[PDB]
Amino acid sequence: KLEITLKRSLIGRPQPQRKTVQALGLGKTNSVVVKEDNPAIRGMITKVSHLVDVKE
RNA sequence: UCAUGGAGGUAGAGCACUGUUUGGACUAGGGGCCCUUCUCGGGUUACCGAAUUCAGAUAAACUCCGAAUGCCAUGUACUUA
Ligand SMILES: [Mg+2]
């Protein structure tokens, strides 16, 4: 598993990034999510790594 | 989002066509000095010169090529509304 925290804002960020975030299950900043380590999920990571911190 | 399959001819690159073009080889032909002379045909001139050909450049309306992305979808994948 891995822990996904939303540290940057979505304001000024394109809707693809926003939708990736909402699909990860994130809302407000400094919000935490715990997910599996599927490559599907790692793709959402690698599309929004600039907004996110990942822990395992 | 991941995987998979696809249309598509952009960026770039390239010259395989089309145009634009540089240098060289080489020339139909035009101009002159003429030899002549029914100026017929030659000596021919680097004074030009269609084209042809070798190498090298160029292209929104050129393409032998050709991505990233984006798009169409499929899935049981994994989240989410
Ligand atoms: Mg170009």
Ligand SMILES: [Mg+2]
């Ligand atoms: Mg073009």
